[model samples]
Target: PQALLIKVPTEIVVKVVDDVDVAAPAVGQVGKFDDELYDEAGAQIGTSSGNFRIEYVRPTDGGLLTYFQEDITLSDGVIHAEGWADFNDVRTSKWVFYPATGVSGRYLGLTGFRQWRMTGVRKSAEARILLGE
Candidate 1:
């Protein structure tokens, strides 16, 4: 059987003209697995899990936007991150980070980074996002 896969390149930021509900969260960094840390031998690193905040500007009949991790500032150009509804249930939720980019960070020219996003109701419904690099 021929395996099928859709891979968007992570090194380059794609194009965006308007706002949407979802975008690539890890186009340049890796997400905290447990928000907790442990050594290779499994020694407790002692830290609480990290949280992601997402605020909405407009309601999603379905909206999408791009953002940076350092500040909640939106980025003109963006990368697309799909397949999020698969991990968590967003049935009544206004917005969510699908968790793609969190696995592909601080590498291939990217120096360092972290992520935290916020989503909720706003203008129509928008998401306030965060990241670091």
Candidate 2:
């Protein structure tokens, strides 16, 4: 399967944060994150500034949708994603990004995953992707 070349959204940014409390409780229902890229000489080459929100649609089950665009060349057009997820105060649960490898799609609607810890625990978690796109 070839790397999918999804359309890069307009006015999207990616930045790298030096430190992120991935275990922090849910920051409201929405938040923004930073991403970074470096150069051959250890220079900051690119970055990403993206936002995500947890939507609880009464008509539909609540889910999380997070996204950020990057200034990088994805020659294959798609990426292989394997990363980790942290739910509440529990141990980290692992996950992967979709379309592991396939034809390019103009749109990439990522329906991310979620998990839980002890019962009655305030639900808050984080998931990431190690990809080329």
Candidate 3:
């Protein structure tokens, strides 16, 4: 079977709207974020709302390892994804997102694999999404 996949590249700007520090025993934190998605021309295409949980801190490099789950709502569909990120520094990090349930509309039944790299700006990132049928 020959299956064709769709690839989408976009830019994202993340803004931490709210966050709470966890008390004792748990040396981590949790927060909610808002994201703006832009097309290649730098035009806004959609928006996202999500939550992130810092699961733990890497002792070796002091990197913050966390999980991010969000729902991106566009004009035609909504893409739901959850993933992990390793924040090694304030300006550099890596993230990977996996398609999850609640995907609907134009993206329904399609699986998306997205990867992100933090840009120089703390809240900006570049992303590439590969969608499979």
Candidate 4:
């Protein structure tokens, strides 16, 4: 698809920890559930962030909607994903920021195969990893 206009309720911002590079931070990357969601750089390579549309070519689901079936797992930590919403003066989504779960190569809103569960365990903002009993 070609580029289109979009007005998200808000935009996504990446603080980068004030001391980390994107590649080292595992930021801007994600697991696509059942599709190719990212690049080696972890950027939304195949997808278009400029347009208001989020797409899924055979996309099953992941990210905010984690209950959906998926062949892949969420990366397990913070992925900056892409820059959106008017230069992003502030972050409206904390799940992808200030991560407290997963390994350096993982992202948040992620899952593993077969009976998916939130991988790793960290906490930021008003949310905890649920890595509890």
Best by TM-score: 3
Candidate 3 global TM-score: 0.71
- Residue 53, candidate 1: alpha-carbon lDDT: 28
**What's the lDDT for residue 58 in model 2?**
30
Q: What lDDT does the true structure give each of the candidates? A: 0.26, 0.30, 0.64, 0.23
Per-residue lDDT over 4-122 for candidate 4, one digit per residue giving the tens place of the 0 to 100 score: 11111211221212322323222332322212233334443221111111222223322221111112223333222222221111122323212122223333333221111122322
lDDT of 1 by residue, 1-133 (tens): 1221221111111222322234433222222212222333544322222222233323453332323222111122222223322112232343445322222322212122222222242212122223323
- Give the residue spans of candidate 4 off by over 4 A: 1-34, 42-66, 73-133
Which consecutive 10 residues in model 3 have the weakest lDDT in total?
A: 1-10
The stretch of ten residues in a row with the least summed lDDT in candidate 1 is: 4-13
Q: In model 1, what lDDT does residue 50 have?
A: 27
TM-score of each: 0.23, 0.29, 0.71, 0.15
Stretches of candidate 2 off by over 4 Å are 1-28, 38-45, 57-93, 96-133
lDDT of candidate 3 over 45-120, digit per residue (tens): 7787888777887888766777778887877778787876654432345555555543888777777565566676
Two-way TM-score contest, 3 vs 4, winner: 3
Residue 88 local lDDT, model 1: 23
- Model 2 TM-score is 0.29
In order of listing, the candidates' clash counts read: 35, 15, 0, 13
Q: What tens-digit string does per-residue lDDT give for candidate 2 at 25-124? A: 3423444544343333544433333443332233332223222222222342322222222222222333323323222342133222221122222322
